[PDB]
Amino acid sequence: LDPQLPPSSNFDLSAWYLSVPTDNNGDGKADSIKENDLNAGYADGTYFYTAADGGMVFRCPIDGYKTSTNTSYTRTELREMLRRGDTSIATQGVNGNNWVFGSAPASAREAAGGVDGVLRATLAVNHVTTTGDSGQVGRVIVGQIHANNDEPLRLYYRKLPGHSKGSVYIAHEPNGGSDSWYDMIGSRSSSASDPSDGIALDEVWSYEVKVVGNTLTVTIFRAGKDDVVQVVDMGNSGYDVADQYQYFKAGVYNQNNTGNASDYVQVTFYALEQSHD
Numbered sequence: 106l107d108p109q110l111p112p113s114s115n116f117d118l119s120a121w122y123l124s125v126p127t128d129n130n131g132d133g134k135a136d137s138i139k140e141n142d143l144n145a146g147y148a149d150g151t152y153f154y155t156a157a158d159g160g161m162v163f164r165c166p167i168d169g170y171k172t173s174t175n176t177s178y179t180r181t182e183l184r185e186m187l188r189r190g191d192t193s194i195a196t197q198g199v200n201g202n203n204w205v206f207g208s209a210p211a212s213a214r215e216a217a218g219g220v221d222g223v224l225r226a227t228l229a230v231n232h233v234t235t236t237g238d239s240g241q242v243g244r245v246i247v248g249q250i251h252a253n254n255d256e257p258l259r260l261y262y263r264k265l266p267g268h269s270k271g272s273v274y275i276a277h278e279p280n281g282g283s284d285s286w287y288d289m290i291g292s293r294s295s296s297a298s299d300p301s302d303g304i305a306l307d308e309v310w311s312y313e314v315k316v317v318g319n320t321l322t323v324t325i326f327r328a329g330k331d332d333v334v335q336v337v338d339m340g341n342s343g344y345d346v347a348d349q350y351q352y353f354k355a356g357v358y359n360q361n362n363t364g365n366a367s368d369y370v371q372v373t374f375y376a377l378e379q380s381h382d
Contacts, residue, residue, distance in 0.1 A: 106159025106375065111146030116161055116377050118144055119190065121183040121355075125152040126169030135170045135180070140190040152181040160229075160373035163356040167234060168366035182356030184251075185379055187218030194218075197253075199350045204381045208318040208345035217350070219381020224248060224314040224353045227376035229307050230262050230271065237364025240295045242266060244361060245370040248314055249354035250321075255280055257344060257351065258314055258321060258337075261360070262304065262372075263293060270303030275323050275335060280343030287335045289325055302330075309375065314353070319345055353379050 106115050123138040130136065138147050148154040156162050165181040172180065188194035188202040199205060204219035214220050226248060233243045248260035256278045264271030272291030276284040286293060291300025304310055304327070311326035319340045325333040344351070355377055357370045 108155060108157055108159050110155060110159070111148050112153065112155055112161040113144045113146050115155060115159055116374070118183070120186050120379055122186050123147065123153055124172055124180055124182050124184060125149065126165060126171070126179040126181065127152075128170040133170070135172045139192075140186050140188075141192075144190070156373050158373075160375050161377070162231075162371065162373045164369060164371040165357045165359045166367055166369040167237070167359060167361050167364045177362045178359050180356065180358040182354050182358050183377075185353040187381070197350065199348065203350035203352050205349065205351060206316055206318060206339070206344050209349065210347045213347045213349070221318070221382060222250070222314075222316050222351065222353065223378075223380045224250075224355060225311070225376065225378045226355055226374055227309065227311045228372050228374045229309050230264070230304070230370075230372045231307060232369060232371040233262070233264050233271070233306075234359065234361040234364045234368045234370060235266050236368045237361050241361045241363050242295075243271070245372060246358035246360060247355070247372055248312055249358070250314060250316070250351055251354055252280065252344060252349050252351050255282070257316075257339065257342065258323065259358075260312060260314065260323065261293065264303075264306065265295070265297065268299040268303075270300050270305050272297065272300050272303055273325055273333075275337070277321065277337045277339065277342070279339070279341065280346070280349065282342065285337075287323075287337065289323065289333050289335050311376070316351075355379075
């Protein structure tokens with residue numbers, strides 16, 4: 106990882122676009138740096154940049170523009186794009202830009218850009234919010250599986266104000282259904298005690314989000330510690346259908362809209378790979 110190289114030279118960012126919470130074209134939404142511009146070595150020194158150690162930094166304040174009116178939170182986050190800069194393929198839809206679970210019909214599988222998926226990342230959470238409502242404070246989503254309108258996976262890190270260590274947990278949201286929650290390390294609760302096995306700020310760790318058919322496996326890897334694995338059976342989740350498309354997300358999604366404007370989340374990634382079939 107080279108400190109003197111942009112993120113698209115330190116990482117393979119050809120299948121990603123970047124969302125940063127500014128509104129430069131006056132459309133009221135977050136800005137998108139699409140694949141072709143991102144991969145020309147885009148870094149703005151404020152939201153998205155190479156660290157002094159070569160890491161790809163995502164930094165995101167509480168206050169700023171959002172991706173749609175359907176969310177209440179800012180993000181500095183990548184969104185997977187299997188078209189890789191081929192703009193004649195649409196962003197949304199079961200097409201060469203997006204993947205489908207292997208459980209979907211043959212039609213959905215042959216049309217899609219990929220079948221099943223594995224997202225791997227290595228990262229350190231540098232900073233989480235310390236301000237705002239008790240139920241929001243300290244939370245950042247660092248990895249996602251997103252579908253047409255629901256989220257098969259949201260991977261959270263949360264560290265509470267008076268704690269030296271933070272927790273890791275996941276949500277699975279069925280198609281048209283509601284979130285199921287799974288604590289992996291520590292606890293998502295706003296009143297949990299300091300997790301003695303938890304993850305500190307600046308501590309390096311790794312995650313793997315994998316889909317084979319209707320089985321989701323989330324693994325947390327940590328040097329010197331056993332892997333932590335959560336399997337989620339999505340057999341009743343309704344994603345094994347022809348009209349659902351899927352994409353990975355990775356970066357910081359700031360789950361706080363109640364703290365100080367300039368409070369923020371920041372995570373540095375050290376490895377980031379997306380793959381399909």
